[PDB]
Design a protein around this ligand. Structure first.
Ligand SMILES: CCN(c1cccc(CCC(=O)O)c1)c1ccc2ccccc2n1
Lengths: 356, 178
């Protein structure tokens, strides 16, 4: 388990430390690719195919948990087989950039990010479902224990193995940076490796974004059900009534979080707040319901009609100042959990305002 | 079997992966330091008790704010790392990692770890940090951050020497059992 030992034992002396190190990293890449493929085939054989064959769950559920596994496996197997081909021409691997570009650039990039994103985007939700299922269904809990007892699982659970694809993608840039580091500069090789490294980052950003939007969408549907915008079915101040039929489902979420509202000088209101693309929405938790409600102060703010200001004496607090001539003469004074949180909330608030 | 899940978090420069490797192998790797540490179960005994400690690396996830949370569920103990040769990594403890970990792992114990302690007194290091006008982190600063963030404990180690490594994990495991 290590290139200088193993292969390249009589062939080591010939080489520089840099070229030894280059070989090691390339070897790690190859060996951990095959290893990753192994893990996917464990998912296939121990879990997916058995769940399917023995009807452990409705096919509609199973497809959400394992959307495109055979495709995922072939993405990696094909690449793996090209690695084998290249190792065939001797244990000292020469140029590698084209093999990297064949997985991470152009069409091959589009394919990998689509397939990886479809496999991962919904995964946190499917796993929560599986967890529920295990609690509630004895046949299912039993099957999961039996499957996880298989030695191929290496004592891990399904939730610990199914995340391997996301984790594998995060390693490629790091493995490329280290190869690049041990590659002679001024080379086309070197340039093309940098290109591959950069495209891997872009692939991670794409999968990051898919998970974000898929989870956010599911989260906002759940919130919508629990939304009660009833006290705005009437109105007090004019500027609240237009959000009586506020539908969270039709907007994008940027951020969310608890904030304390300093409404007067010795009154506070504990809020949960959504930062959407166009609106900041202030909600009160009330059992399991999310109350959209005045105080008067409006509970919805339009980001195109506000300014954001720090508070010099309170590193956890920030102001929102409504700029409509119909606005309140009062500022919304909001308090975050920490100074860090307040930095985050402000950075994102200012950005969203610039784009509103 | 008592099964616990440990997740290691901190800045990308701070030696997360390598720390997991020496704990798991009881050996600093001589000729080559791997970039990849796969999810893996380690056996460890602490206080009489046998424990299976599922080890999760997060290296490479530091720029991807919606990939990271995927490792968090069912975590039993968090190892939060900075590196003693990087006070920048230390300042991200309260600035980045602590709020994230408290949000996604409420009530999960945290152990703060200062890696690379062998460098507190390496001169190449002292001088480099001279330039940006800094110096190696000191145990008192480490320790104060630990109380600041509500950590269950503070620990320093050096992966290169293996010094304090076992002790890091033993502490993390005790925290998982409480
Ligand atoms: C490349 C070897 N290395 C290291 C450095 C930065 C990051 C990493 C692991 C990457 C990560 O997991 O964030 C390992 C270490 C790891 C531990 C060290 C302890 C003392 C002195 C130097 C050390 N170097």
């Amino acid at each position: 388990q290590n290139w200088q030992h193993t292969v390249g034992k009589d062939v080591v002396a010939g080489l520089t430390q840099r070229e030894i190190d280059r070989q090691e990293v390339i070897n790690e890449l190859f060996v951990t690719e095959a290893s990753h493929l192994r893990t996917l085939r464990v998912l296939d054989l121990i879990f997916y195919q058995r769940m399917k064959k023995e009807n452990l769950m409705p096919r509609e559920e199973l497809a959400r948990l394992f959307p495109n596994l055979p495709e995922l496996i072939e993405i990696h197997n094909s690449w793996c087989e090209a690695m084998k081909k290249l190792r065939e021409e001797g244990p000292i691997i020469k140029e590698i950039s084209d093999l990297m570009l064949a997985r991470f650039d152009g069409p091959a990039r589009e394919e990998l990010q689509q397939v990886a994103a479809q496999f991962c985007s919904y995964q946190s939700i499917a796993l929560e479902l599986i967890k529920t299922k295990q609690r509630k269904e004895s046949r299912f809990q039993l099957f999961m224990q039996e499957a996880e007892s298989h030695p191929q699982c290496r004592r891990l659970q399904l939730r610990d193995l199914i995340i391997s694809e996301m984790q594998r993608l995060t390693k490629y840039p790091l493995l490329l940076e280290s190869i690049i580091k041990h590659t002679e500069g001024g080379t086309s090789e070197h340039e093309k490796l940098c290109r591959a490294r950069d495209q891997c980052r872009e692939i991670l950003k794409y999968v990051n974004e898919a998970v974000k939007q898929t989870e956010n969408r599911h989260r906002l549907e759940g919130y919508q059900k629990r939304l009660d915008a009833t006290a705005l079915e009437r109105a007090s101040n004019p500027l609240a009534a237009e959000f009586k039929s506020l539908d969270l489902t039709t907007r994008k979420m940027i951020h969310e979080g608890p904030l304390t509202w300093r409404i007067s000088k010795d009154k506070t209101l504990d809020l949960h707040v959504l930062l959407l693309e166009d609106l900041l929405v202030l909600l009160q938790k009330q059992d399991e319901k999310l109350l959209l409600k005045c105080h008067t102060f409006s509970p919805v703010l339009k980001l195109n009609a506000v300014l954001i200001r720090s508070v010099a004496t309170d590193k956890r607090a920030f102001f929102i100042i409504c700029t409509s001539k119909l606005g309140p003469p009062q500022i919304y004074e909001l308090v975050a959990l920490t100074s860090s949180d307040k930095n985050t909330w402000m950075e994102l608030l200012e950005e969203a305002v610039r784009n509103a | 079997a008592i099964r616990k899940k440990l997740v290691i978090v901190g800045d990308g420069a701070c030696g997360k992966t390598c720390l997991l490797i020496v704990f798991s192998k009881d050996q600093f790797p001589e000729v080559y330091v791997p970039t990849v540490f796969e999810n893996y179960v380690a056996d460890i005994e602490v206080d009489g008790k046998q424990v299976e400690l599922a080890l999760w690396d997060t290296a490479g996830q530091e720029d991807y704010d919606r990939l990271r949370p995927l490792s968090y569920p069912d975590t039993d103990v968090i190892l939060m790392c900075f590196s003693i040769d990087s006070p920048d990594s230390l300042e991200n403890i309260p600035e980045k990692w602590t709020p994230e970990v408290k949000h996604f792992c409420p009530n999960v114990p945290i152990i703060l770890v200062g890696n690379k302690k062998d460098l507190r007194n390496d001169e190449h290091t002292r001088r480099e940090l001279a330039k940006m006008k800094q110096e190696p982190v000191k145990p008192e600063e480490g320790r104060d951050m630990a109380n600041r963030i509500g950590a269950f404990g503070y620990m320093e180690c050096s992966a290169k020497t293996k010094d304090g490594v076992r002790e890091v994990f033993e502490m993390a495991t005790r925290a998982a059992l409480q």
